[PDB]
Amino acid sequence: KKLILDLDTGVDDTLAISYALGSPEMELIGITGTYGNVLMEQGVRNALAITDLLGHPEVKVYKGLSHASTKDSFEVLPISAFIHGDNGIGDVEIPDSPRKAEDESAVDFIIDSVKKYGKDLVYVPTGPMTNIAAALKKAPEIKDEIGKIVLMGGALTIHGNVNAWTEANISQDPDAADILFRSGAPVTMIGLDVTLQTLLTYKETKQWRDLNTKAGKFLADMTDFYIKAYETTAPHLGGCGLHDPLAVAVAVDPTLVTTLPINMQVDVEGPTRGRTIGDVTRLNDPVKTMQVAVGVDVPRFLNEFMTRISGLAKIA
Amino acid sequence: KKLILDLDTGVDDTLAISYALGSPEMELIGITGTYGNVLMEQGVRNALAITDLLGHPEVKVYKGLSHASTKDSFEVLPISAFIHGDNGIGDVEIPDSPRKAEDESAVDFIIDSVKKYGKDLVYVPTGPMTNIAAALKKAPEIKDEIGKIVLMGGALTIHGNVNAWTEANISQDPDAADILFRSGAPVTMIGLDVTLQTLLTYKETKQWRDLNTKAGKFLADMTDFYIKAYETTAPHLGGCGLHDPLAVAVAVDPTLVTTLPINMQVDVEGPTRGRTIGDVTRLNDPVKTMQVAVGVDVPRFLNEFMTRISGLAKIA
Ligand SMILES: [Ca+2]
Ligand SMILES: [Ca+2]
Incomplete structure (x- = not known):
């Protein structure tokens, strides 16, 4: 089984990388870069630098x-600059990877x-979802051919975090997210209704400092800015939410x-633009295309999370 | 076990009465009257007249x-006048009951x-929910003292029917509905996410005509206007949705x-005013005050529905 992350890297986004590389059930093939937490390019610089630091420059x-999808440009909002920092990694200084982005687009890589x-x-x-919307646009066959998609984003049964009805990753490109959900691909939405039950505090990041590694000190310094x-x-x-890692945890x-x-x-269209919600049209259709997460085993996830990431941090 | 309906009577509302009186597990104590489908008074005229017709003038x-809660007046919207008719009973002519409304308010009766x-x-x-909001307002003890509340209204995981985010019964008084949900009373919401899976067509109403009764012909004529x-x-x-009856079916x-x-x-407050949604504040609180219906046994409900109501229609 083989994994692709699509990341606006991103504090929680590197915790997703860390969980992925700490998990032996998947081979992480590549990290597709996107925008939001930080400018798209910055997402790539961080991805390369961090994958190197953890001991996986492949x-x-x-x-x-x-x-x-439907905008000309993009700027980082000052709210996300406060949370994830200017570099998008806390403000943790880390050497640039001398490796660089692959030649082909991530659309085509997918x-x-x-x-x-x-x-x-x-x-x-x-x-x-901007990237996989363009992928499904260019090659709609993907739907049936792909194994599974497992995103982090949205909020079904609860208030969003950008406004009362939308969540960040969906907020940045709703039209793309719509295309994905409607596509009929085997999606699993892991939204706020589940991720806001997840938590970690300095009790957990102090354990990473105890490992005394380049990686351990980095992840601790980073998530402490985030907290x-x-x-x-x-x-x-x-403390802080474990949003993006949980998507990876559910993938495995x-x-x-x-x-x-x-x-x-x-x-x-409406004044609820950017809300994740069931389509009434396909309510009576017994075939359910995707599944939204509503409950979660928080203490087991928190144990799985620390076991995998502390094991990886020991290796670097 | 003992039952009170709170009805804007109402086409589906009489089907709720019919299911209730067809169900031997509950004694229907009274019908509290409210507004929406038709003017509040008209709700009472219909309730009295229909309870008589089915053979239960007690x-x-x-x-x-x-x-x-937060308005001075109320008019019937022309949309609800098209669906439920002017009288609120299709446009089916039925003799007025010579019995009249009880002296005390329904607030106090509850x-x-x-x-x-x-x-x-x-x-x-x-x-x-206007009525039980005023009841919980005047006497908040009710919360813990009452057995269970089982409403029809709202839409959690799906589009509403008034607009994209609100359902009729909640739309008419959101502030009341909020008070109820927040109250902590043992509520069970049966919203569109479940009621739009329910269905009946002329195949079912032709069976009521075959019984040849005063009641059988009435319910058939009535729901055929509704279809x-x-x-x-x-x-x-x-055909038509079985909205209000299903609430009663789940009560039994x-x-x-x-x-x-x-x-x-x-x-x-927001531009999502009237939406039924989870409170984030009480997400991590393990004690869940109410339960929203998401799945339903449609063929068993449809059989339970016809068995009970066709049995009652045979009696009149
Ligand atoms: Ca992210
Ligand atoms: Ca009604």
């Missing part, structure tokens, strides 16, 4: 799209990877989550 | 509130009934539905 980083690995391929996007940002943006939690082990079979859409 | 009809029957009481509102309205307002279904037999334990709210 991870080939491809180059996705800079702006949204399409190619689908035709190579078929149902062994698992695509886990924890940034905007101190959360201390002001959401003091009602105490779908029993970590309890899903609700449901044909879905994303709202494009 | 059902005491009480008088709830005319307008919403509060009194809670203190009399305690945990044997089951309150099943398939109109606006011909649905033929224009929603030709994607073919909660195994007809698969619920999702979830602390809920109703949106009051």
Whole structure:
């Protein structure tokens, strides 16, 4: 079984990389780069540099799209610059990788990877869906050929985090997210309804410091910036959410989550634009195209998370 | 076990009465009257007249509130006048009951009934929540004293029917619905996500005509107006939804539905005003105050529905 991450790297996005590389059930083929937490290019610089630091410079980083499906440009919002920092990695200084982005676009890498690995391929996007929307656009065959998609984004049964009805990764490109959900590809949405139950504090990051490694000190320094940002943006939690890693955890082990079979859409037109919600049209259709996560085994996920990442940090 | 309906009577609302009176597990104590499908008073005229027609003039009809929690007045919207008719009963001519509404308000009847029957009481509102909001307002003890509330209204995982995010009964008084959901009373929401899976066509109403009774001919004539309205307002279904009856069916037999334990709210302030949605604040609280219906045994419900109502129609 073989894994592609699609990342706006990104603090939680590197924790997804760390969980992936700490997990022996998947071979991480490549990291597709996208935008949001940080500018698209910055996403690639970080991906390369971090994959190197953890001891896996075989991870080939491809180059996705800079702006949204229906926008001309993109700037990083100052809110996301406060949370993930300016570099998008806390503000942790880390040497640039001398490796660089692959020649082909990430759009084509996905399409190619689908035709190579078929149902062994698992695509886990924890940034905007912009990339796989363009992939499904150019090559709609993907739907049936791909093994499974397992995204982080949206909020079904709960308030979003950007506004009352939309979540960040969906907010940045709703139209793309709609195309994906409607596509009929075997998607598993892991939204806020499950990720806001996840938590880690300095109790957990102090364990990474105890390993005394280049990687251990990095991940600790990084997520401590992320927690101190959360201390002001959401003091009602105490630490930080484990959003993007959980998507990867469910990709490897779908029993970590309890899903609700449901044909879905994303709202494009109304004043609820960017909301993840069931399509009424396909309610009575018994064949459910995707599944939204509603319950989660938080203590087992937190143990799986620390075991995998602390094991990887010991290796570098 | 003892039942109170809270009805904007109402085409589907009389089907709820019919299911209730056809069900031997509950004694229907009274029908609290409310507004929406038709003017509040008209709700009472119909309730009295219909309870008589089915062979149960012991059902005491009480008088709830005319307008919403936060409004001065109320008019019937022309959309609901098209669906349920002008009289609110198709346009089926039926003799007025010479019995009239009880002296006390329905607000007080509920509060009194809670203190009399305690945990044997089951309150099943398939109109606006306006009435039980005022009851919980005046007497908040109800929460813990009452057996269970089982409403019809809202839409959690799907588009509403008034707009993309709100359902009729919640739309008419959102602020009341919020008060109920937040109250912590043992509510079970049966919203569109489950009721739009229910269906009946002329195949089913022709069976009621075959019984040759006063009641059989009435219910057939009535729901055929309701289906011909649905033929224009929603030709994607073919017949009509069994919205309000299903709430009663789940009150008698909660195994007809698969619920999702979830602390809920109703949106009051935003441009999503009137939306039924989980409260994030109480997501990590393990104690779930109410449960939203997401799955349903449609063929068993449809059989239970016809068995009970055709049995009752044979009696008149
Ligand atoms: Ca992200
Ligand atoms: Ca009704």
